[PDB]
Amino acid sequence: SEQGVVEGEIALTPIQKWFFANNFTDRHHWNQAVMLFREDGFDEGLVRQAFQQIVEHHDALRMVYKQEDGAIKQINRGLTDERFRFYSYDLKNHANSEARILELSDQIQSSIDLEHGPLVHVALFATKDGDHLLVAIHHLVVDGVSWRILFEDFSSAYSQALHQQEIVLPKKTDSFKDWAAQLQKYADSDELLREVAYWHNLETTTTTAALPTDFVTADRKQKHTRTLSFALTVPQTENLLRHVHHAYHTEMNDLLLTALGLAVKDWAHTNGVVINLEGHGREDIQNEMNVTRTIGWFTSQYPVVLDMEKAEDLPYQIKQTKENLRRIPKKGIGYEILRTLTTSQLQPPLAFTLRPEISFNYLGQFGGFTFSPLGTGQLFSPESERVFLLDISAMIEDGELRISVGYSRLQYEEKTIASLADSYRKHLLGIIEHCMAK
């Protein structure tokens, strides 16, 4: 892994190709953001010095996207242009802090220039009760794991800055340019060709059953998106984290998907649902690649087929799903590589016919700052089109496993969604109390 400054054109990864093929409205407004807080406040001269080193260290944050001849070309720029856009607000005397911060946050969320950059927007909101720091980055160069690297490096860069040290960050891992270059070689490799029989077997043995909606609409705009969330108590979560795993020796994704399949069964009255599960995507694509400290959009999407044939036997149900995901090779990273990067007609005719309507994503459990209670503002454009009928996220914060279901109000009433969420909880509690008795 080189430690210099990476420049030049990079190839579009499958998750990047999937973003452009959707043809979103205002595709420049499609970000991920976090809002930080510090009671004693931030120093803007130190925040700028930290981000000046972060964007120089992580070369993927200097990316721009050009639409020449209709095709899209992403170039990793050098240290010649601006590395980030900064916003400074002095709201120490203002009346309403939340309504003013949220209003300014949304404007910063929608002002990302994709062709000329920069893709990183940093906003500092100074109030009478501390300083709020908003960090909004376009989703094309960041994902969940990349944000954990950001929290580590920024907390270290800001620490070295106040101690009047020259900011020294850990050694660079493989660049995002090297990953995408190796991704095409692994795409045309023969190890990936050994997966075609599995994905082809999956696409032919499944029976599609459309999920019921309260209403039918052709308006998939993001402005109609609402979220219904439920959380578990911190004794229920630690039981799920420390006392229920090694009875079946499962992982987090096994128990969360088992209770999800039974929830859809008690809610939509089905026995088979195809879920669009998302993985970290930092798997072994040969060449001994290392992307532990690499920031980028590595998200891998692949359909998972849940079976609710016999929901009475919960022991048989958990073992059914646990062994269902073990059958998947390399965490499904090879699925969309086969439909976006592979340059050969695969000997078994793979058609990619599975169209999942539910998306699942487990973000994981979430040291110098603190996270602000304020929101980040609208992350997508209000005119942006919805891709999935239901977006189900899962994260652990403050010792509480908190599930969130995203839906459109033009398709579901909040009561229909609340039934699926209450059915999802009555199975999560049933699993932890069943796995703790074993």
CA angle 97–103–109, rounded 5-degree value = 125
Nearest to 307 by CA among 364, 351, 355, 258: 258
Residue 357: φ, ψ to 5°: -105, -10
Ramachandran area for residue 117 (φ above 0: left; ψ -120 to 50: alpha; else beta): left
> Residue 404 carries which side chain, given as an amino acid letter?
S
Residue 238, both tokens: 């630690």
Helix axes 144-162, 44-57, angle to 10 degrees: 130
Contact in structure between 110 and 384 (CB atoms under 8 Å): no
- How many C-beta neighbours within 10 Å does residue 289 have? 18
Q: Could you tell me what percentage of the chain is helix, strand and coil, using 3-state DSSP and rounding each to the nearest 5? A: 40, 20, 40
What does the DSSP 8-state code read for residue 398?
Answer: T
Contact partners, residue 396, CB within 8 Å, separation at least 6: 237, 241, 364, 365, 366, 402
Whole-number Å distance between alpha carbons of 99 and 347? 58
Cα–Cα distances (Å) from 418 to 116, 414, 425, in that order, read: 43, 6, 10
**31 alpha-carbon distance from chain centroid:** 10
* Cα dihedral 154→157→159→162 (10° resolution): -120
The residue written with tokens 């210099």 in the block is: 4
Whole-number Å distance between alpha carbons of 211 and 433? 29
Cα–Cα distances (Å) from 186 to 19, 74, 289, 347, in that order, read: 21, 20, 11, 17
Residue 404 pairs with which residues in a beta bridge? Answer: 229, 393
CA angle 127–133–136, rounded 5-degree value = 140
The residue written with tokens 């694509």 in the block is: 285
Alpha helices in 295-409 (DSSP H): 314-326, 334-340
Burial zone of 137 (CB within 10 Å; 0-12 exposed, 13-18 middle, 19+ buried): buried
Contact in structure between 73 and 122 (CB atoms under 8 Å): no
Contact partners, residue 247, CB within 8 Å, separation at least 6: 435, 436, 438
Helix, coil or strand: residue 77: coil
Contact in structure between 277 and 392 (CB atoms under 8 Å): no
Whole-number Å distance between alpha carbons of 376 and 378? 7
Contact in structure between 157 and 45 (CB atoms under 8 Å): no
Omega within 30 of 0 (cis) for the link into 348? no
Contact in structure between 7 and 180 (CB atoms under 8 Å): no
DSSP string, 152-201: HHHHHHHHHHHTTPPP-PPPP-S-HHHHHHHHHHHHSSSTGGGGHHHHHH
Whole-number Å distance between alpha carbons of 237 and 429? 10
What does the DSSP 8-state code read for residue 214?
Answer: S
Ramachandran area for residue 371 (φ above 0: left; ψ -120 to 50: alpha; else beta): beta
What does the DSSP 8-state code read for residue 256?
Answer: H
Cα–Cα distances (Å) from 191 to 186, 326, 338, in that order, read: 8, 18, 12
Nearest to 378 by CA among 254, 227, 189, 172: 227
CA atoms within 13 A on the CB side of 287: 17
Domain holding 331: CATH number? 3.30.559.30
Contact in structure between 411 and 217 (CB atoms under 8 Å): yes
Helix, coil or strand: residue 145: helix
Contact in structure between 228 and 404 (CB atoms under 8 Å): yes
Nearest to 150 by CA among 160, 165, 137: 137
CA angle 33–159–104, rounded 5-degree value = 30
Residue 415, both tokens: 């009561």
> Residue 418 carries which side chain, given as an amino acid letter?
A
CA angle 295–298–304, rounded 5-degree value = 150
Q: What is the resolution of this structure in A?
A: 2.4
Contact in structure between 254 and 320 (CB atoms under 8 Å): no
- Residue 286, domain extent: 178-437
Residue 226, both tokens: 């609402």
Residue 76: φ, ψ to 5°: -80, 105
CA atoms within 13 A on the CB side of 428: 24
Residue 340, both tokens: 């976006």
CA atoms within 13 A on the CB side of 12: 20
* Cα dihedral 317→322→327→329 (10° resolution): 150
Sheet containing 63-66, strands listed edge to edge, beginning at the edge strand earlier in sequence: 8-10, 73-76, 63-66
Contact in structure between 323 and 251 (CB atoms under 8 Å): no
Contact partners, residue 173, CB within 8 Å, separation at least 6: 1, 290, 291, 292, 293, 294
Helices (H) and strands (E) in the chain, counts: 12, 14
Helix axes 234-242, 414-435, angle to 10 degrees: 50
Whole-number Å distance between alpha carbons of 134 and 108? 9
Whole-number Å distance between alpha carbons of 291 and 16? 17
Whole-number Å distance between alpha carbons of 45 and 51? 10
What does the DSSP 8-state code read for residue 372?
Answer: -
